[PDB]
């Protein structure tokens, strides 16, 4: 009777899907690259899909995935043990080198672009008429670090346009030079902001702009990443 | 402590990114809306406009001719009384038209025959609405991924709103409009069939209403944690994966055994859910014409 | 045994207890201190999933099901026959969730991202606790709890629930329920959207984080944006539970008579109690 069938003719649309799914889910990351960077031993009872053609925004090229997933750069980790798995100690400076918690990426040297056309990530001092409607406007807040010291004031706010939302803060350091901070990693209060991740002196190493009015996705990683990394190695001072 | 990105410490604003254009007909988009300075601490603070179309109308419109029948039968029982319409508002119940009639369009008004003229407007509101999720998906140029998953819900609905009750010939084996009236309709259904935990479509349909709970409730736990790294906007990650998308799947492989990409994760749960109104949709289409009882099948399996 | 970009992260330091000790991997699996805890405990669990499964007779999981200290006993210990196990195990089965999470932290320590997960878990974590540690020790004796059975617990609810008339009438349920349905509709549009605009009509250009929003504003008349929804998700979810781990920590410790009865706190209010007409006058 139809009863029996329907419940099995469906463990089909179920396992036959567990597939169709975990398939698509292997375009970025696999095949595995051993403890060196060479194809490894047992490579999952799963194949690799039929790479598809993406049609990027505004003819700014195209991406086909999966595909030549090259590690477009170097690394400063040199194994402290003999067998598979184990940790890989940093060479010198983990942050600058761009590793571990501070790790950054190999993404295009360009700024996101809204559907309209213009740069997509902009600075308030240049937004097309942007007043801060409510909240605690930091433009002028003496941002402090974690090891207790002054390091810079808020001089502007960076927003995403059609996603009108606070994304970044420019802050002039000890030498009148502009740095950029990850909204999503700071704390405004009554009068003083606070960066839980890093400290006074470590603001120095913060990678910086290459045009304080347009910032690329690429650069974003570098900084964001860096900032992160500091939650671990910039803690003997906080 | 710190900043659990649940509330953007700050809000801002500009005009209103009206949106795109493509081939859309804007001689039909209207005026914007105010700016709830609260709806902001979360998503956008912006509001409006919308597409008032050939279908914009028909949809909502006939969508009213429905709730103004569940506002016509409660302004009858309550005895045109403003106090009863409140007290015994819930209990109010317009059940279907008895087994006697059956498959007839000749049911007297008062007794059940006002349930018909009520359902009718309902259909013309969902398949006049579902039908619109397309056009919007089209004038924009987006896969029917949306319009599709809707059908999903319609499923469970169609089964319990016209489907099952045609192979039953009893307009009275459907659900009534009223707060509690249907709540019992369900309980009084787990029963005229036996026990419904014994149903791998409620032993599975159920299953799904759990992942779409754990899963979705993992994507936030996920996505958010790494906002600090371009976590948010998911789009320009598929087309360029960053420490964002990376560190992401990275936690799960070092945790559950594997992971998904950026594009993937979505196609993940997307089905996860649709499968609840689908398994359900089925789950019930059987009870009443292929299994006159279910504790039966718990022992039998044939 | 590694993803193309897993290399550039595997770094020492990151334990809450131990140090560089219980700090290393296992193929694509990580360990940590609670990597051993999520084991020593968990297993000591299946050690008792066999032992109490045998003194039961059969081995088919459609039946196996150690039971809770029967409604008698009380709050005291218990002979390893009925309950004695169900308990000792309840403790170890729980102890692996403690670790399951604490292990999920060293995993948020190394990547240092947000902690949005080892938290979201603690909601399901309690969803459990309450239904075994709390709710029961507050009504009377463990017993009330559920059977760690596969078809037995399904009858643990079918039961207790009806113990108070229909159950839908539980306001802490029905409203903990909606915050469960919707969540799915949530996922329901988030994927069918974000995706619908990633593999748009065959041909044309990939769409944008713009178009997205526009869709609904063109439909509903709004958009909780992007970063918006991705909270709506999390929360909408976490809630439903919190609202449920409640409609239970209640049914019995403060409310006994049938739930459906409570719905009179309303229908029998001063300014319209007597009044003729309707379905109660
Ligand atoms: C919430 C209120 C009730 C309850 C009510 C119900 C109801 C009602 C139903 C279930 C059903 C299920 N319940 Mg339950 N269940 C409860 C508590 C639990 C606990 C616990 C530790 O407290 C566990 C492990 C389970 C587990 C399960 C699954 C075996 C099954 C659902 C599949 C699914 O998609 O799940 C959702 C989870 C996911 C999508 C995540 C992945 C997790 C997987 C599914 C877990 C597999 C566990 C495996 C079968 C058991 C291994 C144990 C061995 C000793 C190692 N329940 C509480 C007490 N449960 C359904 C069924 O029909 O089952 C036959 C069903 O209809
Ligand atoms: C005594 C009662 C029985 C029982 C009887 C039933 C019965 C009977 C049914 C279910 C069904 C379901 N049950 Mg049950 N169920 C029980 C116990 C449980 C338990 C539990 C832990 O005990 C769980 C987890 C579940 C879970 C579930 C779900 C898996 C499933 C419903 C899916 C859904 O969300 O549809 C919700 C989504 C929709 C309805 C989508 C359709 C949307 C429509 C078209 C939109 C209308 C819009 C409106 C006009 C617009 C308003 C907006 C205006 C602005 C105002 N049941 C008990 C034991 N259950 C259903 C199923 O499918 O089962 C297989 C079902 O028929
Ligand atoms: C799927 C299995 C069962 C079932 C099981 C349950 C269970 C279990 C529960 C409900 C609950 C509800 N059910 Mg039901 N329900 C079924 C079939 C139906 C049908 C129908 C035409 O077939 C309708 C109209 C309803 C309607 C309703 C609501 C009155 C109420 C949920 C509020 C909510 O979550 O809003 C979400 C709303 C939004 C996101 C938008 C804004 C909405 C405004 C405030 C609400 C207008 C609501 C409109 C009148 C009801 C729409 C719900 C429909 C399911 C689509 N059910 C089937 C037969 N239903 C819940 C309750 O509280 O019951 C007492 C509850 O716990
Ligand atoms: C006659 C029966 C009653 C009834 C009685 C009850 C009762 C009694 C209870 C519920 C509860 C619930 N009911 Mg009910 N319910 C009824 C009808 C319905 C209907 C309907 C349409 O009729 C619906 C939608 C629901 C819906 C719901 C849910 C909102 C809620 C359970 C979710 C939860 O808390 O999970 C909580 C999640 C957990 C406990 C799991 C946590 C996961 C753990 C930590 C992980 C384990 C991992 C495992 C060991 C590993 C396996 C390894 C494998 C490799 C995977 N009920 C009927 C009317 N319902 C429950 C509730 O609210 O509980 C608080 C509850 O107790
Ligand atoms: C896997 C299935 C999941 C799912 C999916 C789902 N739901 C969907 C879709 C999908 C894919 C849609 O595309 C569709 C949608 O358009 O969503 C935005 C929808 C939808 N899901 C809805 C509800 C819903 N879905 C639920 C669940 C689920 N939906 C599942 C979890 C539930 C619960 C809690 O169980 C509910 C209540 C609807 C809101 C919407 C479909 C709308 C519809 O069918 O409309 C017909 C039209 C009417 C009834 C119009 C009358 C409206 C009011 C009476 C008028 C008052 C308000 C008005 C604003 C006044 C204006 C006055 C003027 C003067 C300005
Ligand atoms: C808002 C809360 C939502 C949620 C969240 C959630 N769940 C989570 C997480 C989060 C944030 C995790 O990080 C964790 C995870 O790793 O997910 C991939 C997890 C998880 N959610 C899980 C399950 C789960 N979540 C559920 C629900 C939910 N999870 C909610 C919807 C459900 C339901 C409702 O059915 C289930 C079954 C696990 C698969 C996983 C955690 C896995 C884990 O901790 O594994 C190590 C544990 C062991 C090896 C345990 C062995 C123990 C002994 C052998 C005995 C077993 C005793 C048990 C009492 C038996 C029960 C038998 C049943 C038949 C009754
Ligand atoms: C976009 O963002 C996101 C990602 O990234 C891009 C992600 O990846 C993910 C998560 C990834 C997915 C692929 C989602 C998949 C869907 C599910 C429904 C998953 C749930 C199902 C399961 C079966 C979970 C598996 C769980 C367990 C516990 C497996 C354990 C197996 C064993 C054999 C036990 C081993 C136990 C331990 C403790 C290891 C120690 C071992 C020793 C030998 C010592 C999400 C949600 C996400 O949103
Ligand atoms: C970018 O795309 C989009 C998403 O992400 C990909 C989304 O998640 C959503 C969200 C959609 C839902 C259906 C879920 C509900 C959303 C909330 C924000 C609920 C808030 C929670 C509360 C506890 C507040 C309670 C108060 C009120 C007023 C609830 C009213 C609920 C609504 C769903 C009203 C908004 C919808 C419409 C159609 C306006 C009707 C107006 C009335 C006055 C009624 C939308 C619209 C979207 O477009
Ligand atoms: Fe998402
Ligand atoms: Mn221009």
UniProtKB/Swiss-Prot annotation, chain A:
Its main location: membrane. Its cofactor is a bacteriochlorophyll; a bacteriopheophytin; Fe cation; Mg(2+). One of its GO terms (molecular function) is bacteriochlorophyll binding. It holds the Pfam family PRCH. GO terms for cellular component: plasma membrane light-harvesting complex; plasma membrane-derived chromatophore membrane. Coiled coil: none annotated. It is found in: Cellular chromatophore membrane. Belongs to the reaction center PuhA family. Heterotrimer composed of subunits L, M, and H. This is Reaction center protein H chain. It comes from Cereibacter sphaeroides (Rhodobacter sphaeroides). The gene is puhA.
Swiss-Prot record, chain B:
It is found in: Cellular chromatophore membrane. It holds the Pfam family Photo_RC. One of its GO terms (biological process) is photosynthetic electron transport in photosystem II. GO terms for molecular function: bacteriochlorophyll binding; electron transporter, transferring electrons within the cyclic electron transport pathway of photosynthesis activity; metal ion binding. (7R,8Z)-bacteriochlorophyll b binds at residues 182, 202. Keywords: Bacteriochlorophyll, Chlorophyll, Chromophore, Electron transport, Iron, Magnesium, Membrane, Metal-binding, Photosynthesis, Reaction center, Transmembrane, Transmembrane helix, Transport. InterPro entries: Photo_II_D1/D2_sf (IPR036854), Photo_RC_L/M (IPR000484), Photo_RC_L/M_CS (IPR055265), Photo_RC_M (IPR005781). Signal peptide: none annotated. One of its GO terms (cellular component) is plasma membrane light-harvesting complex. A ubiquinone binds at residue 252. It comes from the Bacteria. It is a multi-pass membrane protein. The keyword Ligase does not apply. Fe cation binds at residues 219, 234, 266. The chain crosses the membrane at residues 53-79, 110-139, 142-167, 197-225, 259-285. The reaction center is a membrane-bound complex that mediates the initial photochemical event in the electron transfer process of photosynthesis. Belongs to the reaction center PufL/M/PsbA/D family. NCBIfam families: pufM (TIGR01115). Reaction center is composed of four bacteriochlorophylls, two bacteriopheophytins, two ubiquinones, one iron, and three highly hydrophobic polypeptide chains (designated L, M, and H). This is Reaction center protein M chain. The gene is pufM.
Curated annotation (Swiss-Prot), chain C:
GO terms for cellular component: plasma membrane light-harvesting complex; plasma membrane-derived chromatophore membrane. Residues 56-82, 139-170, 251-281 are periplasmic. (7R,8Z)-bacteriochlorophyll b binds at residues 153, 173. It comes from the Bacteria. PROSITE patterns: REACTION_CENTER. Its main location: membrane. One of its GO terms (biological process) is photosynthetic electron transport in photosystem II. The keyword Glycosyltransferase does not apply. The keyword Magnesium applies. It holds the Pfam family Photo_RC. The chain crosses the membrane at residues 32-55, 83-111, 116-138, 171-198, 225-250. Residues 1-31, 112-115, 199-224 are cytoplasmic. Belongs to the reaction center PufL/M/PsbA/D family. This is Reaction center protein L chain. It comes from Cereibacter sphaeroides (Rhodobacter sphaeroides). The gene is pufL.
